[PDB]
């Protein structure tokens, strides 16, 4: 099956494609937002400015896809 060329989906490794796009961590996956355009993950506390909670919204788009 598929396996990431960067991290081999090894949970002991960082990956800014498979896990948080800003810190590459797998921690707190319930606080990592998925961008509905690029499907990258982002810790609420890695964003700048940071979010205090997961938005109550239908969809969310990351600063890169928003181009701001």
């Amino acid at each position: 099956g598929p396996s990431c060329k960067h991290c081999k989906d090894d949970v002991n490794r960082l990956c800014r494609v498979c896990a948080c796009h800003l810190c590459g961590g797998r921690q707190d996956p319930d606080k990592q937002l998925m961008c509905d355009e690029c499907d990258m993950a982002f810790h609420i506390y890695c964003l700048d400015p940071p979010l205090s909670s997961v938005p109550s919204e239908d969809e969310w788009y990351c600063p890169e896809c928003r181009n701001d």
Binding site: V17, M34, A41, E57
Partner: peptide
């Protein structure tokens, strides 16, 4: 109510969809 990484990881179909997309991109 946005999707989290945990929501993806817990769903085998969502997880496989994400793996397939990453593999394709890395090609």
């Amino acid at each position: 109510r946005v999707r989290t990484l945990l929501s993806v990881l817990k769903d085998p179909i969502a997880k496989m969809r994400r793996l397939v997309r990453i593999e394709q991109r890395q090609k």
